[PDB]
Design a protein around this ligand. Structure first.
Ligand SMILES: CC(=O)N[C@@H](C=O)[C@@H](O)[C@H](O)[C@H](O)COP(=O)([O-])[O-]
Ligand SMILES: CC(=O)N[C@@H](C=O)[C@@H](O)[C@H](O)[C@H](O)COP(=O)([O-])[O-]
Lengths: 223, 230
C-alpha cells in the first residue's frame, strides 16, 4: 500500500512474475492464470504483471502481493498495444491493480500519452511507463510517472537492453528492468545495472515459448 | 510394440526434448486438468514425447494428446529409497492407461519388488522399458535384462548432497557402450540440454525448468535478491 518509496523498499532486488500465457493456448485461461498467481506467491514472488481487466479482478481476489495491471489491444490504426485507452485504465483500477502500466512511446495512438499517464495518477494507482528509448523515460518523469521500464526497447534483438537500465537508474528513476531477461543471471545483471526490480514473463509463464527454446537447441545439435 | 519397434522410436526421438510434466506436489498447478492442458500445449508447440506421473494422469493425457507417453508412478515409501514405479501393480496400471514406455528405478537398493521382476512385468504388458539409473552398473544390469532405454535419471539422487549441474559423464558412458541413452536430470537450460545431445544422448528429458513454476521462480529471485542486498 501507500507511498512510492515504500513500494521501492518492498520491490528492491525482487523478480516480478509477468503471468501472460500465449494467446489461444489451452493455458490462456483465467483459472490457470489465478493458479499460477497463487503459486508464485507461495514461492516468494512479491509482485505480478497481469493482463486483462477480468484477469486482474480474479487474481486480486486471490493474492495479496501487488498487481501491475495492463490491457493488450491490437488496434487497426496504431502500433500501440499496452493499455491504449483511459477506459482500460479505469477498469484496471476497478479490478484492483496497484500499478497500471502503459505504452509511453511517441507514436500514433487513439488517446494522447499525457492523458493516459494522468488518468492513471487520478486513480490513486501508481503509474509505470513502458518505454522504448531513454527519452520516453524523460517524458514520463516530467509527467509525474513513478516508474519507468525498458519494456518496449527493441520492439519498435536478442540480448536485454542494459544501457537503458543504466541510464534510467543513474537518472534517478525508479527503474523496472523488463525485456528478454531469460535466465536468473541476466536478471542479476539488471539489478546491478541499477534496476530496482526486474520483470520476467516468457521464461516463466509461456510454456510453448520455452519448449521451443529447448527443441531448437537439442534438434540443432542432433546432427 | 503397440505398433512400433525400438529403432523406429529412436529416430522419432533423435535430438528431441522430452517434456516432464510433473507439477510440485500440493501445488495449485498439480491438477489433472492443468496437467492435461500443459500436455496439449507442448504437443501444439512441437514436443514429441512426455514423461507423465500417475496412472490416471497417464490415462487423461493419453486421451488428449497423440505423442508417446513415458509413464511412471512415484511413491515415497517408509521402508525403501526407491521411488520410481516400485510395484508390479503400478506397471499394469500404466500400460492400461496408455503409456508407450514405462520407466522404473533400476538401482540395486532396498525395494519392495526386485528390479528384475519389475522389468519383466513391463515386457509382459508389451510396453517398452526405460531404466532410471544412478550408476553405469545400473545401465549395464539393465542391458543384461533387455531393457530398451537407459537414463541418467537417478544420478545424484542416491546420496546426500544432491547436485546442481547435470551428470554428463554417465550420459557419455551409456552412449559409449552403444546404449539407447536418455539424458535426464538437472538439464535446466537449452544449452546444457544441447551438451547432452553432443554427449551422445538420443533425446533429453527436462522437467523443473519447464513445468515447475515455483522452482523456476525461486531460481530467479535467488539471483536478483542476493545481488539486490549487495
Ligand atoms: C512487447 C510486449 O508486449 N512485452 C511485454 C508486455 O507486457 C510482454 O510481452 C512480456 O511478457 C514482458 O516483457 C515480459 O518480458 P519477457 O520475459 O517475456 O521477455
Ligand atoms: C529423482 C526423480 O525422481 N526425478 C524425476 C522423476 O521422474 C523428476 O522428478 C525430474 O523432474 C526429472 O528427472 C526431470 O528432470 P529435471 O528437469 O526436473 O531436473
Amino acid at each position: 500500500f501507500l507511498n512510492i518509496e515504500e513500494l521501492k523498499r518492498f520491490l528492491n532486488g525482487q523478480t516480478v512474475v509477468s503471468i501472460q500465457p500465449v494467446t489461444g493456448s489451452p493455458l490462456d485461461k483465467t483459472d490457470f492464470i489465478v493458479a499460477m498467481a497463487i503459486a508464485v506467491e507461495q514461492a516468494g514472488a512479491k509482485a505480478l504483471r497481469i493482463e486483462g481487466v477480468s484477469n486482474v479482478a480474479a487474481v486480486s481476489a486471490a493474492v495479496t502481493i501487488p498487481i501491475i495491471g495492463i490491457v493488450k489491444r491490437d488496434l487497426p490504426d496504431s502500433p500501440v498495444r499496452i493499455t491504449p485507452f483511459v477506459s482500460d485504465v479505469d477498469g484496471l483500477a476497478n479490478a484492483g491493480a496497484t500499478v497500471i502500466a502503459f505504452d509511453a512511446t511517441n507514436r500514433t495512438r487513439p488517446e494522447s500519452r499525457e492523458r493516459i499517464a494522468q488518468a492513471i495518477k487520478n486513480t490513486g494507482c501508481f503509474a509505470m511507463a513502458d518505454c522504448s528509448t531513454f527519452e520516453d523515460g524523460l517524458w514520463a518523469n516530467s509527467q509525474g510517472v513513478e516508474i519507468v521500464g525498458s519494456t518496449l526497447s527493441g520492439y519498435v534483438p536478442t540480448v536485454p537492453d542494459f544501457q537503458l537500465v543504466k541510464a534510467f537508474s543513474e537518472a534517478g528513476f525508479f527503474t523496472m528492468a523488463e525485456g528478454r531477461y531469460n535466465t536468473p543471471e541476466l536478471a542479476a545483471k539488471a539489478i546491478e545495472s541499477g534496476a530496482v526490480a526486474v520483470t520476467v514473463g516468457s521464461a516463466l509463464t509461456r510454456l510453448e515459448v520455452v519448449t521451443q527454446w529447448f527443441n531448437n537447441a537439442t534438434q540443432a545439435a542432433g546432427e
